[PDB]
Structures are given as C-alpha cells and as structure tokens.
Design a protein around this ligand. Structure first.
Ligand SMILES: C[N@+]1(CCc2ccccc2)[C@@H]2CC[C@H]1C[C@H](n1cc(Cn3c4ccccc4c4ccccc43)nn1)C2
Lengths: 206, 206, 205, 212, 207
C-alpha cells in the first residue's frame, strides 16, 4: 500500500504536469551545454572526416515543469522519455553523417522546473587531420547551435570552456592535446537578430 | 508569460483547425529553392558516385497559414515540425542512395503565410569525376524537383543562379571552381504536363 | 473564396473516397515498366549488381472512380502510397532490401487509375563475368507479386523494350540491350498460373 | 452495373470474413500448444568472410501452422477458401537464428496466406549473416557450416518445431553463385537442460559448399 | 481450449489495467539481475580500437504490479508478451561506438510471482585496444553496463555469478576467450549523493 501510494503520487504529478510551445522572443530560454569527450574513433584523411564519441549535456529550466514536493508526496524529481517533453534542436553545423544516438532518450526533471538530458552520440564532421602524426598534432572545430531559434529565443551557455576529459578513452588511437567549448555570438548581414553557437575545438594526435 | 504561451497555443490551434490538401491546378504554388554547398566529401571513380553535403532552402506561401499579428498578441512567426504540415516533395532525380538528413526537420511559419524549411542533407548522386586531378577539374550535375506535381501545380523559382559557397568547407579534399542552380522546364513522354526542376551544376577539382 | 472553394472540392472528393485487395472474383491488372538509370556497381567478388531505376506501376480500381462533374471538375489528385492499397510487386532474386529514392506518392485519376513511380536502388544476383569484353555480361531478374497468382494480379507491360532514355551517359557501364518480358509460368502444383516480368540486361564496361 | 455489384459483393464477403476473424488468440501455451513446420529454400550464398568467419545467405524461410481460431466454413462467406493478409495482422511465430551476427534483412513483403481450415503459410525471403568458418571452401571437399533456428521464448511445450523433410530445397539456388552447394540439410533437434523440465527445439541448417 | 485462451486474455487485461507502474523510484526501488552469454568476438579493429561482440544479455527484475494468483486464472503460471508492452530497464553500454544491434525478437516472459525475464541477443561495437591479441597473454578489454538515468537508489544491479557464460562461445571464432567476468561496481560521483551501479564486462582474448 505504501508502494502503491508512492506510485500513485508520481502518476498524479506526471498527469498534472502534462495537462509549453517552445521558447519565443517574449518567453526566451537559456540552454546550458557541455561536452564529455570519450573517444576520437577515426580520423579519415581520404575524406577529411573525423568521428567523435561524446556525451552531450543539455540543461534548461521551465516554469511549466515546476511543482511543490509537499503537494506530491515529497517527490523531488522524475524520469520521462525525452519525447514526452520539449527538447532543444541543438545541432552540429558541419556534420557529414546523421548523428548516431548511443543511449536511451530519457530526461531527468527536477521540482524547480529544471531538465537534464544527456544523450551519448557518435558524430562524423568536417575535419582535416593533417599533422596528426606530428608532435603539434591536428586541430579541428565544429559549431553546435539551435537549427531554427535565434539568440532572441534560445541563449546558449557553458558552465566552463574546458571540455570534460575525465572519461576520455585511455587507449584511444588519438591523444587529446586540448578540448574547449566556447560560446560565440554571431551577427550576420542577412539578419538583425544575433545568433549563438558553442564552438568545440579539439587538438589531437596519434 | 503564460499569456504569451496562451496566445501562441491559440494561434496554432486556430491554424490547425477546409484543411489545405496540397496544391492543385486551381490553387497552384511556387516553391523557392536554393542550395548552400558545404562540402564534397567523397568522389568515387570506381562507381561514378559523388557525395555532397549542403543546405537545401525551401520556401513557399499559403493563404491558409496567414494571420493578423494584432489578433494574436503580435506573434509574427512560430516553429513546427515539418511532419505536422504539408511540405513539397522536392527530390533529386539521379541519386544513388536515399538522402541522409543531417538536421532537425522543423519549419518556420511567418504571419504572411510563408514557410521556410532548410534541411541539411548528404546526397550520393551519379557523377563521373574524371578530370578532378587536373586544372580544368570535373563537372557534375543533378536535377531537383517535385516528384508528382507538374508545373501547373508546383512551380519552382530560384532567387539567384549562383550557389552560395561562403559556407563551403575550406579544408575539403575538393575545391569548387563553380556552382550554379538553374530553373528548367521539361516535358516527358509519360505525362501530359511539364515538370519543373532546378539543375545543380558543380565544377570541382582536388 | 475561389481557392477555398477548390480546396473544399478536393477535400470533399478525398473524404468521399476514403478494398481488401484483389481476388479471383475481383482480379486486377498491374502494368509495369522500367526506366533504367544506372548500373552503379558490378561486384565480381560476390556476384551482386546494383541498379538504379524508375519502376512505373499502374492499376485501376472502380472504388477510386468519380465523376469530375460532381467534384468541381477535379480530374486527379495526389495521395500518399501508404493511404491506398498497392501491389506487392517484388524482385525475386534481390540480395539487399530495395532502397527507395523517391517520395512514396501516387497519382489517382477519375477513371480509378492509380499511378506510382518509385525510384529505387536494387542489389541482385548477377555474375558479371564477361563485362570486360566486347560481348559483355548478361543478367536477369524477375519481378512479380509475392503472394498473388495470375488469377488475382495479371502483369502487363506496354512494351518489351526497357526505357533507356534516362540512362546515365557517364556510367561505368554501357547498356547493350535491356528487355522486360511478361512471362506466364504454369506449374503442375496449382490450378492458377503465375506471372512475372523478366528484366534482362546485357552490359559492359 | 450488375458486374460492378458482383465485384462489391465479393469484396463485402471477404471484408466480412476478415472482420469476423479479427477471445483473441494470445499465442500458444502449454495448455494450447502449437506445431510450426519449417522448411528452407536456399537461394544464394552471397559472401563468405574469412577475416571475420561470417557467411551471408539469401533464402526463403517457409513457416506453416494451423489455428482453430482462423477456421471458417466457405459456405458462410461466399465460397471464399483462402485470403492474403499482412503478417502484422496475425500472430506469427518468433523463429530466430541462434548465431546470427547482424540483424536479419527482409527482402520480400510480409504477407501470409490463410486457408479456411485455419492453416497459415508465411514465406519471407531473408538475408542472414551468421557465424561460419569458410576454411576449406577453396578446396574440392568444401567448407561446412551450421546455424540453429528456433523460437526465442517458447519451449517445446508451447511450440513444437518440425520439418517435413531433411532436404533443403535447392531447386531455386542461383546457378551462377560464387559458391556451389554440396549439400544442405535441415534437422529437428531436441535439447534437454537439467535446469528445466521442458524440452527445447531447434531446426539445424547444415550447409556444405565451395567456390564454384 | 477457448477457455484457456480466455483465461490468458483475462489475466493480460487485468494486469495491464492495474495505478500504472511509472518506473522505479527511491520509495519503490528495483533490483535488476544481469548476466552475459558471450557468443563471439566477431571483429577487432586495430586502426580504430573498436571490437565487435555478439552475446545474449539476460535481464531479470520483479514487480508487485505483475503478480497474480494462478488459482484465480486457471493455473496459468507465466505468459509471453512483447517487451514494448511492459516497463523495461534502460540498461546501456557506457562506451559503445555504434548503436547496439538487436538480433532477437523483443519478447519477455512474465511469471506469476511478478518476475520478468528478457534476454536480447545483441551485437555491440565498443572501445577496446586489441594490442597483444597476436600474443599468448592476449589483449584485455572492458565495458560497463548500467542504467542511463537511474541511480542505485532506484535500480540496483546484481549478477548471479561473476563468470561470464562461455558455454555457447563459437568454437571457430577468429578469437579464443582466455577469461570473461562480469562484476558489479558501486560508483560515486561528486555531483550526487546517490551511488550509481554498473556491471563491468572484462574479456581477455587472443587470436
Ligand atoms: C523525372 N520525373 C520522371 C521522369 C521520367 C518518367 C518516366 C520515365 C522516364 C523518366 C519524376 C521526376 C520528374 C518527371 C516525371 C515525374 N512523373 C510523375 C509521374 C506520375 N504519373 C505516372 C506514373 C506511372 C504511370 C503513369 C503515370 C502518369 C501518367 C500521366 C501523368 C502522370 C503520371 N510519372 N512521372 C516523375
């Protein structure tokens, strides 16, 4: 009965929350982004493509997802399918293959309205690995950002400019020399609204 | 702020509630098409296939998607999944693999009824790269157009005949010597009505 | 108002129109034709060949007939191929799942004709020995219904000559000839005859 | 007009049959077990990969079973004796290759033929990569490989798996294959594990082949 | 026989209309037992340090909400159901380099005490340096499996043994197995007061 009780309290919370159209200029949203780089799998010098495996941490906060734990049996967080909630359209801008998702698509929602979503991904992107067989290595970069929302609708932030490297694969064919993730504001001539991306820059060698 | 979210939900609800059944000879449609070439990833002379990554910009305008911003809290635009609305069946005529989609598929609808849809794609198509190792380079071409709508239903237009190369990957294995996109009208033995395509012609070398 | 009127006539038509497939009492004729675009690849290590082609399919249902005069003079419309019955026509010696290159949309006309032309890439069983010679190599593949006999689905072509007017002029392979021949198979097992179209292609580097 | 009405009449009778056929069958059980007959038609050995010991087969897998819940009297349904239906509309057995190395690839539509006595015939074409050492294929004696097929989750108390013959049908084998078949058999096997009182049934496909 | 089918359908209707199970929580936690049956090391790629494994992954858990008295249901003790019809754990490989490939139907066995048995066959590419596979000591690689979003306070992981089942290992694989273990690990992250659990698969092999 106590188990049924706690299950009922969670079902009641989720039912209440699921009964938000995305950010707008009137209701903008900040998304925090961070990369945990696991592996440089392949560097292909015949096509100038490089394959990364990483965890992409995304976090945003919505008033529509807030609740008072006292009103819901002291539940402070829950797990739901990422398809049950809005998620940002953050995309690599210079990929050469569809990203491959390696993990279940499940987000964690906290009572303050906070959402954490961390998909693991394999990405092929445009990168000339010339010099990777040298001491100074090779340098490659790829920008991530919303596909359809400007800086007036989604702002992008990092908690740090240092890519988390504490899970990089120790026996990779490639050693990481540096890995940074840097927010950039762009002003294009096409458009008066600013655009935001996070630039991932990785220096590596064999 | 719940007010602005409610205004956007009211607009979307009004718009989604005659449904637009696609264009016809009595209600024809003009689709504007343009390419922004990012990369020639691979040119395979053993099979005469070449792989291209590009943005394909598509734009059209529908009365049924118009609204007065005054009646909807001055909302001027919104975002919706491309699967939630009619989109044109623009197709490469001479691909050799199903096109790969590299971006979210989200359209931007604006209050004048116009729709902007810009998928990023990777495409393999029939292309003989003989001469790519020479100064004159190699020239290839591929037509894009509606698969099943004639020019009396979907007409195509370009805003320029010059393919934008400013996002072309500077360290590609191949450099672009020229890239044009040209509207064509074609009649076919099969079918009584002309079909419209845009011919994408690219000249490139190592 | 005029554009809303025509959109409403189309939606009324589609609504009114929206069959358990064919049977021996209610049989169906499918017309089939091939437009061969490219022999992409001829793999002598596995005796597989990859073709790219348009496959014209056409059939007629009384259940999709209408009088244009009752529907604002509409003579035809477009609809998703997953919204209507389509025949189970299949290559009999493929070695990979066919790859679909075109959107799956059919044309329907007021006489009840359905018209469907998927672009496709097909790997199929083919020994290319001889392709590096003047006589070339020759390969064949049969197309037909998977589960319907000739008493349920009859296959017809409009001609035995494959359409080569869109063959890729710079292919690695040149086409010496390409034919698409209706065949009636009579088996002793079964009272019903079976029907395929045999696609025969002779080609060389 | 009369012809039109005859056509609609037969259509209505078939729609009535399928609507009538569709207590729902919940799959087989120890109380209501089921026999599934399995036979293979080998079309082609496409590829033998000696660097990974994987071999690729194209074949038709014939499956047959009979359900009381699919019977009907043709007299009650306009003399209809059989119909075609998508394999997703009915229960189908979970017959699986036990040592595949890639997901099976389906090459044909997934359509079953249901006959008025309740017998179902389902013949999908498939491409399968499975574990196989091709050492000897470049010799006159050839190489021999095997793969077991069986239900993934039903024991012999729920699904009895049978063959009609040990002889794999080779009459459609591709005459210009890179590999010629020396023999191919399909044999029912019963395993008992001491863990569990229930038997477990597979059909073992054994193929001996060599470079052409 | 119609009566036994109606009993099974009655049971399945009663279980699937029960409040709905929302997944495990701190207050309603769950233990998942994991075990691997290793069939084949298909491929070891030294140019990318990726290795491909084929295995069966046994998963077992128990839910109050799937319990029933066989006496109320014609002595039915178990049934088969699609894995999409029940809650299943988000068990994931932490260092794969391609999406896992599923080789078996996604069907589970549910038992009257509420236990679920689900055993997918899988092909997995994961991060592994095969240097030494050409030698007598062989090479050694490891990959963790665990929930993707659930802590040890919601999903505990157990193995029934630490010895990977090698009884179905392919005898003519390009590679032989020197040893293979599956070890529960308790993992503490500075982010979080709750422990995280994984099962570490360690395989030593050689040509
Ligand atoms: C290249 N298209 C194809 C070219 C083609 C096409 C047939 C051979 C050889 C190159 C795409 C591309 C644009 C132009 C023609 C387009 N198109 C759309 C359709 C639909 N359609 C049919 C389909 C099957 C059978 C008959 C018809 C039919 C009859 C009248 C009007 C339209 C028809 N047919 N062709 C298809």
């Amino acid at each position: 009965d106590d188990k049924l009780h706690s299950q009922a309290n969670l079902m009641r919370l989720k039912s209440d929350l699921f009964n938000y159209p995305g950010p707008t200029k009137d209701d903008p949203l900040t998304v925090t982004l961070g990369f945990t780089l696991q592996d440089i799998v392949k560097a292909d010098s015949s096509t100038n493509e490089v394959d990364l495996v990483y965890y992409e941490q995304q976090r945003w906060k919505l008033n529509s997802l807030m609740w008072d734990p006292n009103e819901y049996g002291n539940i402070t967080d829950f797990r739901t399918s990422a398809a049950d909630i809005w998620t940002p359209d953050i995309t690599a801008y210079s990929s050469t293959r569809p990203v491959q998702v390696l993990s279940p698509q499940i987000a964690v929602v906290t009572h303050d309205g906070s959402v954490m979503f961390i998909p693991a991904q394999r990405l092929s992107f445009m990168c000339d690995p010339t010099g990777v067989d040298s001491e100074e290595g090779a340098t490659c970069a790829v920008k991530f950002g919303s596909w359809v929302y400007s800086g007036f609708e989604i702002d992008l932030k990092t908690d740090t400019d240092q890519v988390d490297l504490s899970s990089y694969y120790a026996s990779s064919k490639y050693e990481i020399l540096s890995a940074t993730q840097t927010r950039q504001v762009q002003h294009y001539s096409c458009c008066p609204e600013p655009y935001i991306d996070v630039n991932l820059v990785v220096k590596f060698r064999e």
